[PDB]
Structures are given as structure tokens and as C-alpha cells.
Design a protein around this ligand. Sequence first.
Ligand code: BCL
Ligand code: BCL
Ligand code: BCL
Ligand code: BCL
Ligand SMILES: CC[C@H]1c2cc3[nH]c4c(c3C)C(=O)[C@H](C(=O)OC)c4c3nc(cc4[nH]c(cc(n2)[C@@H]1C)c(C(C)=O)c4C)[C@@H](C)[C@@H]3CCC(=O)OC/C=C(/C)CCC[C@H](C)CCC[C@H](C)CCCC(C)C
Ligand SMILES: CC[C@H]1c2cc3[nH]c4c(c3C)C(=O)[C@H](C(=O)OC)c4c3nc(cc4[nH]c(cc(n2)[C@@H]1C)c(C(C)=O)c4C)[C@@H](C)[C@@H]3CCC(=O)OC/C=C(\C)CCC[C@H](C)CCC[C@H](C)CCCC(C)C
Ligand SMILES: CCCCCCCCCCCCCCCC(=O)OC[C@H](COP(=O)(O)OCCN)OC(=O)CCCCCCCCCCCCCCC
Ligand SMILES: COC(C)(C)C/C=C/C(C)=C/C=C/C(C)=C/C=C/C(C)=C/C=C\C=C(C)\C=C\C=C(C)\C=C\C=C(C)\C=C\CC(C)(C)OC
Ligand SMILES: [Ca+2]
Ligand SMILES: [Ca+2]
Ligand SMILES: [Fe+3]
Ligand SMILES: [Mg+2]
Lengths: 255, 318, 311, 42, 41, 40, 56, 56, 280
Amino acid sequence: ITHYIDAAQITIWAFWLFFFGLIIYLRREDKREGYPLDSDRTERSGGRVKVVGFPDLPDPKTFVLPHNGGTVVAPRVEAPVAVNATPFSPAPGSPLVPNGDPMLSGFGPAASPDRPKHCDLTFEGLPKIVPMRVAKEFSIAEGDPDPRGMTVVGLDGEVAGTVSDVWVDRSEPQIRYLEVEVAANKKKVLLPIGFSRFDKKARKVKVDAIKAAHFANVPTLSNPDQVTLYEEDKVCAYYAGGKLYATAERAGPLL
Amino acid sequence: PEYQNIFTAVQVRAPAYPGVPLPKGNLPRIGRPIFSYWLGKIGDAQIGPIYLGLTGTLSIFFGLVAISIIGFNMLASVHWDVFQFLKHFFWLGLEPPPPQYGLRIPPLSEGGWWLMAGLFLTLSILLWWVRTYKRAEALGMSQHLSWAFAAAIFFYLVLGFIRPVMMGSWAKAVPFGIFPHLDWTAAFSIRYGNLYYNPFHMLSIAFLYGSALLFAMHGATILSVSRFGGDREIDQITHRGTAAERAALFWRWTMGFNVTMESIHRWAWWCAVLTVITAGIGILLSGTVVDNWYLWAVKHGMAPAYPEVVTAVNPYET
Amino acid sequence: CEGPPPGTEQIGYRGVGMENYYNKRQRALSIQANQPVESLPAADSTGPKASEVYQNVQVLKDLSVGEFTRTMVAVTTWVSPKEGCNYCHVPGNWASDDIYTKVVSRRMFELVRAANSDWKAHVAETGVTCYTCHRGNPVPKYAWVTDPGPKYPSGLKPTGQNYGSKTVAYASLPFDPLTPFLDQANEIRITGNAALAGSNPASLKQAEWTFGLMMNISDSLGVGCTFCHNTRAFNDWTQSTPKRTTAWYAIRHVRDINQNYIWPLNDVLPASRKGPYGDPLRVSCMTCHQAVNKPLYGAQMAKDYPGLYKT
Amino acid sequence: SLTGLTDDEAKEFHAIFMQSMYAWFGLVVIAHLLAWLYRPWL
Amino acid sequence: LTGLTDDEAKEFHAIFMQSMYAWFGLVVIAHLLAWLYRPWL
Amino acid sequence: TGLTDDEAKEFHAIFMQSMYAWFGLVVIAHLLAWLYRPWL
Amino acid sequence: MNANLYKIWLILDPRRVLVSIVAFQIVLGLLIHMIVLSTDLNWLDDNIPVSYQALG
Amino acid sequence: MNANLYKIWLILDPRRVLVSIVAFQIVLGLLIHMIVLSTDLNWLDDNIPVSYQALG
Amino acid sequence: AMLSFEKKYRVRGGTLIGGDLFDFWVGPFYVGFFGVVGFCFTLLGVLLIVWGATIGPTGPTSDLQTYNLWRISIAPPDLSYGLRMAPLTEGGLWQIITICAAGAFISWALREVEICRKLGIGFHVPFAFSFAIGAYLVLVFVRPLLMGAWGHGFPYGILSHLDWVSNVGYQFLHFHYNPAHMLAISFFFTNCLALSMHGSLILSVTNPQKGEPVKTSEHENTFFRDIVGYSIGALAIHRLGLFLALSAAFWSAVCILISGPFWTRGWPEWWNWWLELPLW
Ligand code: BCL
Ligand code: BCL
Ligand code: BCL
Ligand code: BCL
Ligand SMILES: CC[C@H]1c2cc3[nH]c4c(c3C)C(=O)[C@H](C(=O)OC)c4c3nc(cc4[nH]c(cc(n2)[C@@H]1C)c(C(C)=O)c4C)[C@@H](C)[C@@H]3CCC(=O)OC/C=C(/C)CCC[C@H](C)CCC[C@H](C)CCCC(C)C
Ligand SMILES: CC[C@H]1c2cc3[nH]c4c(c3C)C(=O)[C@H](C(=O)OC)c4c3nc(cc4[nH]c(cc(n2)[C@@H]1C)c(C(C)=O)c4C)[C@@H](C)[C@@H]3CCC(=O)OC/C=C(\C)CCC[C@H](C)CCC[C@H](C)CCCC(C)C
Ligand SMILES: CCCCCCCCCCCCCCCC(=O)OC[C@H](COP(=O)(O)OCCN)OC(=O)CCCCCCCCCCCCCCC
Ligand SMILES: COC(C)(C)C/C=C/C(C)=C/C=C/C(C)=C/C=C/C(C)=C/C=C\C=C(C)\C=C\C=C(C)\C=C\C=C(C)\C=C\CC(C)(C)OC
Ligand SMILES: [Ca+2]
Ligand SMILES: [Ca+2]
Ligand SMILES: [Fe+3]
Ligand SMILES: [Mg+2]
């Protein structure tokens, strides 16, 4: 006997039903941050219309933090935060332009959310990211130079200061920040390893993100022996603003 | 110029971590950890320690027996000549039993060793699955790894056990050998009328390509935000930072939508898992349900048609 | 490693990917190494027939004495040029059959006449001479015997595969497809004619034996699989090239040669012509083609020798 | 100045650059003459 | 600009040219020997 | 490198004698080889 | 040529141009030699002045 | 040439330059020998002055 | 609309070409010069694909014209056209769509560079996307050029390009033995394993067993040391995943680039250099 329907055809159709169900599941999970959307439709509706697209948002999940750190929920209602910028044009879809000195505006690649004002912790409950002054069990791996005492140069090759310490991850041993004693003001500021190139034979750290004089305004730590999530983002974002803001040419275009 | 965060320029050292303490009933870990400078250039310099209870000890014993039976038979097939074993290594193999034996345990001289290696490798893998399950349980972690491992085991089982049993013959299973298992792969497509026309083969390719697409995207995305600590995905997930915001906006502005730091790992999980689910289903249907995938595709209207520029008289017709 | 550009030829419809690539410098040197020996001047075709002039002519009966002498000169250059006429002849007695080379040669004449007259579905009008196989050597360079493969210990049965073998072009596929398919006549087809399972008992290992034979065939002709197949449907004659039809008859031709011409000569051949299993050196695609799609790049030698055709 | 060179330094680089390029171009012409005399291609 | 003094760049140039000229000399000898044995043009 | 100017003179002296010594062996081996199996 | 052409090095990096020329030329030289060898002008395998493999 | 050509070493790093030359030359020498060995100029398998395997 | 945290990142500038002229978004999409340029290439290419489906291989009235999604095929020219432009109905349509595709892809990558400049992030993603583009260009530009005809490109058809892959592969008898292909596949498989391991680990520590708090960096490292005696690290797994995926694309491009231009015999026979070493 012959039939057009066969088991291979049945099974492939069954797969499509599963797969489209899976995609809808995934798109819901994708909306646990950043939704509902900031639109001009919600503004004029007086907030009546929430823009969420399809599928709609999932019910909130809870993240229980260790060491009695509290509970995080997702999705969550997050308060609007003023933008320190003015639109270049009033038309929708236009960019904005930072107010004041761009490096210091907290806008564009200088921007960042306000992370929590407590430190990431080791499993045992100590501050995770700390200078080698504090975690004395750490050493420099034999074969590699000690960054302490190296001179830090900005994007234009001028001396910004000297490395005064190294900040390490106690959970997963690696350098996360260099501590820079800034020549101009004698403050000690963090420098993320992600923005640092070593010139080993010269014992120099090169920082392409900012000029030497920009080190004077790197955001400062409340406590010299630990760093909060909040301060980590403020530090890293300040260097990143330099990628677009630190010189005029960086605005573009090429042509 | 900028630091790309591909290689660690300056490593630091601390006393080796012995690991998160395990609950009562777990055995103490074994090994004195060492440090590799060159591994420390690309990743973690620490090697060891390792956990080894009953599950893993049994797994490793079964697995070494299986591997040794294969290597032994390869060397015997060049008459113990170690130099010819190195010459022909990629060609040598441990061969499935002849078709005359069906699914019966075949003689030691002609297929018994294949059947024993498949049995003992399979038990070794199943026990390794239990190991991945137990190691998550002892740390209080969920079982995502063992579920994905089970999907790969499903495909492996279909190749060497389920389909051969359904088809009535160990001779239809896979040989243990480098080039021999490539012969088997090509011959399987030939025998079943071109695996390109198997729709679960097409899906498995979409998901294998998609896995490389997604790890290239995600790997590169995270390194581009590692300057903001984006590689620390636990705290970016509980406490969204500018790493996670910039990652999502890069993709939203590029292609119109984006995921979250947690949910990209769900996309990645399913893409990889569906590679081997669809692969198992595709092989499971070959020979049992569909005997010629090209003709199955003709029947369901899928095969392209071309202007005829070559053609051959069938001498069986003449 | 080779250097670009390769020579190229389109075989199938644009975009189907049926294309041939070859190395130009190796092709030119192959052509030089596959030169055909210039035909002898035409002989007088008159006078009494060899059937009535000579004492023991059993095959070349109807040639004139001139054409017969010319034929003997030709086979001497093609088969035994270093040794000369008496490679096949008892000194002082041309009629005598008391030398194994003459008995073999008599049957070789029948082989060639049968190929040129009865197997044109394969060799067309080009045909074959003694030279096609022998190339000036008494023992053809590319004859074959059943291959025992590497030694195993006595308690393990050889698999017949999983070994680096030139015979299947260095794959680990079953390395002796010559004995089961070009001597014996095992079934080559494994592909089903219905989409759904239920009527095709062929096996994956049979697919591998067939694949091994197809490696040997391709290597023997210096071609890829698309010389004869559209590989989206290896079995489908309507999508194959006309070379596949020719190859089908060539397989049956080779079987006829080995079963009916070489094997019955085994007892008169010396032990030096036999493999470890006692079987005689015999014929494959490589013996004539010698890695070229047509022997001698298709040079038409046989047409100039009337004694190489039946009646 | 956009490259940090002085007007005196750019004059000096140009002089050496031009002489070195002309010398390299000279060797190129010599080789094409030999090539032309041995294997004319036009 | 390379951390080399004008006198250092002058000395390195003298040794560089004498060495490059000497290497080129061996190349000519070798190509002379090769041309005598197997002329390729 | 850290070598003084005299440390380069000394190393260069031993290096050149060593390399020349090695090169003398290669010539003898190639003379022996040419006599046994001339390849040109 | 203009009298003030030397002012090009007040606007283009001398070291970048030199490296760029050097890289371009070595690549072009390799490209042209392989192009010429792929044609009838081929001087290696042209059996001229004589074929040396024919010597035995 | 020019009297002030030496100043190139104020522009290009002498050592790197040195090292690059040694690497290019060794690779070029391996490459050219291989290329010549794959042409009619092959001096190893040309049976000149004799074939030493024909002696066996 | 914008993500609820997005407005503070929508900065002016960072373009490579265009400046204020095209420096704007359209809904979620950033546009810019390469958005406009890429949009034109993209819309043209797609519409020429639909036009090619509309007329089929031999005209819209023949039995070969089809809108069946699996059977639509736009094919390259005959090899006899060499490096010339074929007539539109004889493969030239494929050639124009190819140029559109390359321009769409490259414009997409440069748009990605402008987005990285706005966000002040590294350039890893457009760098990585360049490997996929490079493989596509090996397939339709470098390898066809080295063999002398644009007709060596693959056809634009969902199933018809699988026929191309099959017939190009079997030109080399047993393509599995291509050494760069074996290496590339090893990277594809290893990448899929690594991706499932990485996805699993992040989800299992952020979604632990009921009653458990979110797990730590120490748990992540401990977990794979417990299974395999080694942990590569949370930064390095992303280095590794990028290395495996780019290596898979790179050795793919190499493996097709040598198939024809640098090797013409069967692929198993390449391994005879090994078998023929005078050691055995
Ligand atoms: C017809 C074909 C000809 C022939 C004609 C040619 C011609 C013409 C020439 C050669 C040249 C050479 N030929 Mg030849 N050649 C023939 C057959 C041979 C055979 C053989 C077995 O048949 C051998 C082995 C040689 C060998 C050689 C070399 C002696 C020489 C190339 C040296 C070089 O590359 O400098 C490399 C350059 C350097 C500056 C090397 C510097 C040394 C440094 C210090 C090495 C340090 C080690 C290094 C740092 C290691 C790297 C670090 C790693 C990480 C380990 N020829 C025949 C008979 N040959 C050339 C020559 O003689 O040059 C003068 C040359 O001009
Ligand atoms: C026709 C074919 C020839 C032949 C002609 C050649 C030619 C020509 C040469 C060799 C050379 C060598 N041959 Mg041979 N060779 C043949 C067959 C063999 C066989 C064999 C099993 O058949 C063996 C194992 C060897 C072994 C050797 C080594 C002794 C040597 C390579 C040394 C090296 O690489 O140093 C590299 C290491 C360094 C540079 C480090 C620095 C120096 C150190 C201290 C060297 C150690 C001392 C050295 C081994 C002493 C041996 C020198 C003798 C005079 C041979 N030959 C035959 C019969 N052979 C070469 C040689 O003799 O060099 C002197 C050489 O020129
Ligand atoms: C029939 C075809 C011809 C042929 C005709 C051409 C023509 C025409 C030219 C070459 C040129 C070159 N040929 Mg050719 N060439 C042939 C066969 C060869 C073979 C061979 C194994 O068969 C070799 C290895 C060479 C090698 C070379 C190089 C010496 C040179 C280009 C190098 C480069 O990229 O410059 C890039 C390097 C730089 C820019 C460095 C800058 C200056 C430095 C400091 C000097 C380097 C040394 C210099 C090359 C000295 C050699 C000059 C001689 C006159 C050759 N040719 C044959 C037989 N060839 C070209 C040349 O000589 O340019 C002057 C050139 O015009
Ligand atoms: C009989 C046939 C042969 C065979 C013949 C060949 C041939 C011939 C080729 C391969 C190629 C590959 N083969 Mg193979 N191969 C065989 C069997 C195998 C098996 C197996 C399990 O047996 C596997 C694992 C592989 C694996 C591979 C990969 C290494 C490689 C494909 C990946 C690639 O190119 O990425 C690179 C990725 C790309 C090229 C994609 C580019 C994407 C572009 C830049 C963006 C597109 C955007 C898109 C249009 C957007 C649409 C938007 C939406 C509509 C919204 N092959 C057999 C034995 N194989 C191919 C290769 O290496 O190509 C380079 C190739 O040409
Ligand atoms: C999503 C689908 C993909 C996938 C998923 C996947 N695979 C997985 C997992 C997952 C989620 C695991 O959790 C599991 C794993 O543990 O990975 C780290 C596994 C795994 N995937 C593996 C391999 C693998 N997966 C493959 C594929 C894939 N895996 C997919 C593409 C491939 C391919 C592509 O062919 C291979 C080759 C192993 C690394 C591991 C399963 C290991 C296992 O079962 O081990 C038991 C078997 C043995 C043979 C044990 C032998 C013991 C060793 C020889 C060590 C010897 C020790 C001895 C004490 C030495 C003493 C010597 C003295 C001298 C000192
Ligand atoms: C290099 C490792 C892997 C990789 C990485 C990679 N790919 C990437 C990226 C990266 C890092 C991106 O950033 C980029 C992206 O934005 O992804 C969301 C992209 C991407 N990789 C994509 C596809 C993709 N990548 C693949 C592969 C891979 N990408 C690798 C294996 C494949 C395979 C394997 O086949 C495909 C199908 C897209 C999702 C996206 C690029 C989107 C883009 O360029 O948009 C512009 C173009 C269009 C909107 C359509 C253009 C239409 C053409 C003008 C006409 C069509 C012509 C085409 C040639 C026809 C083909 C027909 C048949 C073959 C069916
Ligand atoms: C051919 C037939 C189809 C073939 C398809 C095969 C699919 C199964 C094979 C793979 C096995 C996966 C096992 C693990 C699963 C898992 O792990 O899911 C659990 C995790 C959640 O865990 P957590 O991280 O939240 O917390 C961990 C703490 N316990 O993820 C998911 O919820 C994924 C969501 C499931 C996907 C939904 C699909 C719905 C389809 C609906 C179709 C409707 C059509 C109706 C038509 C009438
Ligand atoms: C001499 O060698 C020594 C001793 C030194 C050690 C060296 C060992 C070496 C070199 C080993 C090399 C091994 C290699 C190269 C292996 C390559 C293997 C490959 C590529 C394998 C690929 C695929 C194989 C598969 C998928 C096989 C699957 C088989 C299965 C699933 C069989 C299951 C069988 C079962 C469950 C049997 C049950 C028996 C029953 C219950 C039915 O009994 C009645
Ligand atoms: Ca010449
Ligand atoms: Ca010689
Ligand atoms: Fe991740
Ligand atoms: Mg096999």
C-alpha cells in the first residue's frame, strides 16, 4: 500500500512545531532586561501604552544572592535616569550630543548604569578584587615583569604617572586593574587591564583611551582597599569615553 | 592600537585553589596542583586537582579497556610491526562484525573485539554522564551540562547501537578508526541515497554552523566588553553593568534585536544541543523509514530540476 | 602541492558542480609517456592466404603472407622487442607450439579480435592492440593478482580493508575490489529505487566495497566521479554521463577477459606469473588505461592491422 | 606640521627618497632591458 | 626616532652594506657556478 | 643584549672559529660523498 | 614637478610610506613572477636551452 | 647612491630589519630549491651523471 | 523605541564615512552611510533573486520555472565565459547578485565598526565577521579567479547548492581526506562541544538548585576541575570559543582554496607523501 504521508514527513513537521515554541520561549527570556521599551508612544499616551512587542514579558524570576546579599528580580521596574545630553536634531531617531566637557558628561561611551554600592565577593565572603598590598599571598608569575614601578603613558605618549600597585581577582587569580599614582595630583586611580598595553623592555604601560592629563579626572574610590560594582563601572566607562572623546579626530568621519 | 585581551601579558600567582568544599559522601579530591606558564598565557595556569569516586573510576576502567582493545587490534592488523602501525595509523581500524552474525555475539577472531569495545566504551560514556550529573549535584548547581551531554549520547547511541539493533546487524554500526570512520560516513550517504536530502541532516548543519556563528558572535562580543568586566557574566547577570548594556546595544543597532547576558547562554545551549538531537533523528530514520533520501525529496517535491545536458542509456534496460 | 592554474572542463549543467580539474604539466608529460608506436608500412594483400601457406595457423588464417609477416613484426615490437621473434617460437621451427609463449599468444590474438569486433560498446572504433597492455614488455606492467593484504596473527581474521592501499587510491576502503567485481561478478548496485524502506536489503558494507571499486576505476582512468556520475544520485542513469554507459560494458568486458581468456591459461603460465594464491596475473581497467581516460589518449592503432579483427 | 617633521627635515627626506626611488627605478629598467633582449614579449 | 645616534646609524650602515655586498657576492658566485653547469636560459 | 663590547669580541672569536670548524667538516663530508656518489 | 613637493612629508608619515612601498613591492614582485610563469613566457619549464631530463 | 642614506637607520629599526632579512632569505631559499626541483632543471632525479639504482 | 537603558548611549559621531548626513537610527537599527549603502545592495540582490525565480532557468513559461522554496536556483555562468560578464539570462544575473552580496556583507561589517566606535567597545565582532566574509569571497572570488572562470562559484539555491558541494567534493573521489577539511571539521565539532559546555555552565550557576544562592566564580572553576582536572577560566572560555569558531572558518577557506588551485588528484592520494617517507 502507498501513502503520501510518511514518518519522516510527520517527524519534520513535529520538529517545526517544537522549534517555533522554543523561539517564543527564548524571546521571552530575552526581555528580562531593558523592557518595556522607552518610546515616544508611551510619552504621549501618558504612560498608558507599554511597548513590549511579541512575545510579552515573562513573569519575574528571582536571583538569591549569597552571604545574605538580598534578592534580584528580573524583569524589574527601573527608574528613568536623566540623560546629560541634548538631541542634535528634534527628529525621532536622531543622536544626542553630550553637555559640557564630553569626557565628564557621563553620556555616550562615557555612560554606565549605577551598579550596586557593594563589592563582588569571593566564595568565602571577602572582597574579590583587591590590591596586592592587601592580598599578600599573590606574586608575579616568574618570567613576567612586575608592573609596579612602570611608567604609565597616555595616548599621546606623555607620562601620566607610575604604577603604584596591582589589583587582582582573589577568586580567579589574574590582574584586573593597575593602580596609578597620577603625577599631576598624586591621587591613586584604577586603570583597567583591558585598556593597558605593556611595553615590557621599556617598562611602560601604554593607554590609548585617554591623554596623560585626563588621568587627573579618573573616578575615585571611596575605600582604598576594595572596589564596589558601582565604582568598577564608573572607572571603566570613564576610559571608554576617551575612545570617542579624547581627541577631535576620534569623532570621525574619515571622509 | 589597543589591548585585544587575547593573551595575558603579565600573569600573577597564588596558592592553588583546592576547590569548593563538597558534602559528606564525596571522596577527597586527588592530585597536587601545578602551574603551567604557557597555559597561563591563554587561560588558567592551574592544572588539577581532580575528583575521582566510584562512578569515574568505573568509567575510566571501562574506557581504557575499550581504547586498548581498539589499539591492540590496530597493531595486530599490521602483524605487531610498530613501525608499520605508525605508517598506517590513520588507516587502521577495529572493524564491526560481518553481516552473517546478525546481532549475535560474534567470534573473537571476527568481530568479538568490536562488540566488546562498543559495549565497554558505551558503559564508560554512560558512567561519565553520571559523573557530570554528580559533580553538579555536589556543588548545588543545576543539571544543564548533563542534559546537553545526554543529547550527544543519544546521537552516539543511535550511530552504534539503536540503529544497528533496529536494522538487525552489528555490521551496520561504525568502525573504530580515523579514515575508516570517514569511509563509513561517506558510504552511509551513498547507501541511503544522498544525506544532503535528509531534512534532519539539513537542520543539524544549520545548528552546527549556527553554533560557530553564535560562539564567534558571543566570544567576540564578550572580549570587546572585557574592558568593562563583561567576562564576569555571573555579576553582569545579577547586576547589569555597562558591559551587558553595550553588548545588547551593539546587536540591537546591528540587527534590530538583542538578548540578555543570561539568555545568550540559552540560545547557545539550544543551538548546540539541537545539532545532535537532529543528527540522531536523521540517522534514526535512515534505513528504518526512508531508504533513499533523494527519492524521498523528489516525492515531497523538494529536489531541484535542471536542463538536461548529460544523460546515459541504462544498459539494464537495453 | 600543485600550482595554479589547473586545466578545467565543464561536464554538467552550470552550477551543478560537475567539473574536471587536472594539472597541465602532468598532462603534457603523460601524453609524452603514452605515445603510440607508428604503424608499419602497408603490406601486399594478395597471393595465397596464410591458411594455405603455413603449417599451423589456427587464428590468422585469412591474412595474406605479407600481412601475416607484418603482423608478426608488429607483435614482436609490441610484446618482446628485446628478445625478438623467438620469444614465442621454437628455434628452427615456426609451426611448433612447444613453447608456452606461443600458446598464450594464440589466445591473446583471439582476445584482441574479440575486443575489436565484439566489444565496440566499450572500445568503439579505437580498439586495442597488444601494445595497449604490454607496452613493449612481455609481462604487462599493470596486470594484477588477488591481494592478501598485511599479515595478521593466526587468531585474528583479516578484514580486507583499513590499510593504506594504492589499489583504492590510498583510501582505507576494502583494498581488493578487483577479485570480487572485475573477475567474479558481484552485484555493484546498493541504492534503493523507492523512497521508503521495505524492499532494499543491500548493506552499508556493500556500499563500501562498491565505493572501493569506484575509487579504483576513477584512479585507473585519471578522472573524478563526475566523469560518469551526478553524485546527487549515483544510481540515476538519466542524470549520469554517457561515460557511465561505456564503463558498464567495460566491466563486463574485463570479466569476460579474465574468466574466459586469462584464467584458462593458468596451467600453461609459469609459476613466476602467479600471485600468492596461485591465480594468474590478469586484467583490470588500469592494465589498458594506465591512468588515462582512453588508452594512449585514444590513439587509433588497431585499424591499421586487419589481423586484429574477427573474420 | 602634521608628521612632526620640520621644513628642513622634509626637504632632506624628499631629496634622499627621490634619489633612492630613481635608483630603484633604474634597476627596474635595466632588468626589463635584459628581459626584453632575451625574451621580448611584445 | 629609532633610539640610534647619528654616528651609530652611520656605523651600522657601513657594516650593513659591506655584509649585504658580501652576501650578494656569494650569490653571484653560486649563480655563476650554476650557470656553467646547467644554463637555464 | 647586555654584552659589553669586549664580550662581543670574545664571543665572536669563538663563534667564528667554531662555525669555520663546522664548515670544514661539511666540506670533508661532501668531498667523501662526491667521490663515492657524484650527483652532478 | 612642483617646487614644494617636499611638503608631502609634512602631511604623510615618511616611515609609514616606506614600509607601505616595501610591502607592496615584494607582493607585486611575487605576483608578477607567478603570473609570467603561468603563461607562454615561462622560462623554467621551456626546455630551453635544452631539456635536462632527456639526459637519461 | 646618496651620502645620507645611512639615516634610514634613524627611521627603521636595525635589529628587526636584520631579523626579517634572515627569515625571508631562509624561506626564499627553501622555496626556490623546491620550485626548481619541480621543474625540468631537477638535478637529483635526473640520473646524471649515472642512475645509481640501475646499478642494483 | 529604545531599551530602557539605551538613550544615554545614543551619541553623535564615530562614523567612518558620512558624518551627520546618515548619522541616525530607524527604530532599533543604526543606519549611517553603510546602512544606506548596504540597504541598496541588499534590496537589489533580494529582488534579483525573486526575478531569477520568476523566469527560472529557461523562461517563465517552461516547466522548470518554480517558486518552490527548495527548488529555486539562480546559477553561475558556464565555465566558457572565463572571467567575463555573462549575459543576464546565462549566469550574469548570478554575477550581479554576487557583487551585491559582497557589498552588502562588507557594508554590514563597516556599519558594525561604526557602532563599536559609538559604544567605545573592542572591534572583535567585525574582525570575526570578516572571517565569514573571507570564506564567502574564497568561494566566489579567490578560488574562481585562480582557476580562470567565475562559473566555479556555487549556485544560489537552497538545495541546488548542496548538489554543487557534492559534485565538487567527489571530483576528488573521497573529499573527507582533505587535510585542511579534517582540521576545519575538528574545529567545528570542538566549537559545538565548547559552546554547549559554556552555555550549560553559566545557566547552571545562575539558576542553581532550589534553595541555593547564585553560585560563584569558585564554583565554575571547581566544577570542571572536578570533571576533567582543568578549568580554562571565565575570560578564556570566550577567547577559546572565538579561536575555535574563527579557526573553523579559516581552515574551511583554506580547504576549498587548495581544492583545484593547489591540488587536482584524489584527496586520499595526498597522504602518499606520508606513506612514501623513507622511514617505513
Ligand atoms: C641547479 C640547482 C643547484 C643549486 C644552485 C643554487 C644557487 C644559484 C644558489 C644556491 C644556494 C644554496 N644552495 Mg643550492 N643548488 C643546488 C643544490 C643544493 C642542495 C642539494 C642537496 O642538492 C643543497 C642542500 C644546496 C644548498 C644551498 C645553500 C648552501 C644555499 C642557500 C643558503 C641560504 O638559503 O641562505 C640564507 C641566508 C642567510 C643570510 C642565512 C644566515 C644564517 C643564519 C645565522 C641562520 C641561523 C638559524 C636561524 C636563525 C634558525 C631560525 C630559528 C628557528 C625558530 C629554529 N643546494 C644545485 C646543484 N643553490 C645559494 C647560495 O649559495 O647563497 C650564497 C645560491 O645563490
Ligand atoms: C651519499 C649519502 C651519504 C651521506 C652524506 C652526507 C653529507 C654530504 C653530510 C652528511 C652529514 C651527516 N650525516 Mg650523512 N650521509 C650518509 C648516510 C648517513 C647515515 C645513515 C644511517 O646512512 C647517518 C645516520 C648519517 C649521519 C650524518 C651525521 C653524522 C651528519 C649530520 C650532522 C648534523 O646534522 O649536525 C647538525 C648539528 C649542529 C650543526 C650542531 C653543531 C655541531 C655539532 C657538535 C655536530 C655534532 C658532531 C657531528 C655529529 C660529528 C659528525 C661529523 C662527521 C665528519 C660525519 N649519514 C651517506 C653514506 N651526510 C653532514 C656532516 O658530515 O656534517 C659535518 C654532511 O655534511
Ligand atoms: C624571463 C623572466 C625573467 C625575470 C625578469 C624580471 C624583471 C623584468 C624584473 C625581475 C626582478 C626580480 N627578479 Mg626576476 N626574472 C626571472 C627570473 C627570476 C628568478 C628565478 C628563480 O627564475 C629569481 C629568484 C628572480 C628574482 C628577481 C628579484 C631579484 C627581482 C624582484 C625582487 C623584488 O620583489 O623586489 C622588491 C625589493 C625591494 C623593493 C627592495 C628595495 C631595494 C633593495 C635594498 C635591493 C634588493 C636587492 C635587489 C633586488 C638587487 C637585484 C637587482 C638585479 C638587477 C636583479 N627572477 C626571469 C629569468 N625579474 C625585478 C628587479 O630586478 O627590480 C630591480 C625586475 O624589474
Ligand atoms: C561529497 C561532498 C563532501 C564535502 C565537500 C566540501 C566542499 C566542496 C566544501 C566543503 C566545505 C565544508 N565542509 Mg565538507 N564535504 C563533505 C562532508 C563534510 C562533513 C561530514 C560530517 O561528512 C562536515 C562536518 C563537513 C564540513 C565542512 C566545513 C569545514 C566547510 C563548510 C563550512 C564553511 O565553509 O564555513 C564558512 C562560511 C561561509 C562561507 C558562509 C558565509 C556567510 C556570509 C558571509 C553571510 C551570509 C549572510 C546571509 C545571506 C544573510 C541572510 C539574512 C536573512 C535572510 C535574514 N563537510 C563531503 C565528504 N565540503 C566548504 C568550504 O570549506 O567552504 C569555504 C566547501 O566549499
Ligand atoms: C552539543 C553536542 C556536542 C557535545 C556535547 C557534550 N559532549 C560532552 C559533554 C557535552 C555537553 C560532556 O559533559 C562530556 C564532557 O565531560 O566534556 C568535557 C562530553 C565529552 N565529549 C567528549 C568527546 C567528544 N564529544 C564530541 C561531540 C560533541 N559533544 C558535540 C559536537 C566529539 C566529536 C565531535 O566527535 C568527541 C570526540 C569527551 C571529551 C567527553 C566524554 C568523555 C567520556 O565519556 O569519557 C569516558 C570515556 C573514556 C574513553 C575514558 C577514558 C580515560 C582516558 C583515556 C584518560 C586516562 C586516564 C588514566 C588514569 C591515565 C593514566 C596514565 C598514567 C601513565 C598516568
Ligand atoms: C566565522 C565564524 C562564523 C560566522 C561568524 C559571524 N557571522 C556573522 C557575524 C560573525 C562574527 C556578524 O557579526 C554577522 C551578524 O550580524 O550576525 C548576527 C554575521 C552573519 N552571519 C550570517 C549568516 C551566516 N553566517 C554563517 C557562518 C559563520 N559566521 C561562521 C561559521 C553562515 C553559514 C555557515 O552558512 C550563514 C548563513 C548573518 C546572520 C549575519 C550577516 C548578515 C548580513 O550580512 O546582512 C546583510 C545581508 C542581508 C540582509 C541579505 C543579503 C542578500 C544578498 C544581497 C542576496 C543574497 C545572495 C546570497 C549569496 C544567496 C545565498 C543563497 C543560498 C546559499 C541559499
Ligand atoms: C521531532 C520531534 C521534535 C524534536 C524536539 C526534541 C526536543 C527535546 C530534545 C532535547 C532535550 C532537552 C532536555 C532539556 C530540556 C530543558 O533543559 O528545559 C528546561 C530549561 C529550564 O531550566 P532553567 O534554566 O530555567 O532552570 C533550571 C532549574 N531546574 O530550559 C527550558 O525551559 C527551555 C524551554 C522548553 C522549550 C519549550 C518548547 C515548547 C514547544 C511548544 C510547541 C507548541 C506547538 C503546539 C502544536 C499543537
Ligand atoms: C596498542 O595500543 C595501546 C594498547 C598501546 C593503546 C593505544 C590505543 C589506540 C592508539 C587507540 C586508537 C583509537 C582510535 C584512533 C579510535 C578512533 C575511533 C573513532 C573515530 C570512532 C568513531 C565512532 C564510533 C562509534 C560511534 C561507535 C559506536 C559503537 C557503539 C555505540 C556500540 C555499542 C554496543 C553495545 C551497547 C553492545 C552491547 C552488547 C550486547 C548487550 C548487545 O551484547 C549482546
Ligand atoms: Ca629555460
Ligand atoms: Ca644529478
Ligand atoms: Fe559567556
Ligand atoms: Mg570500512
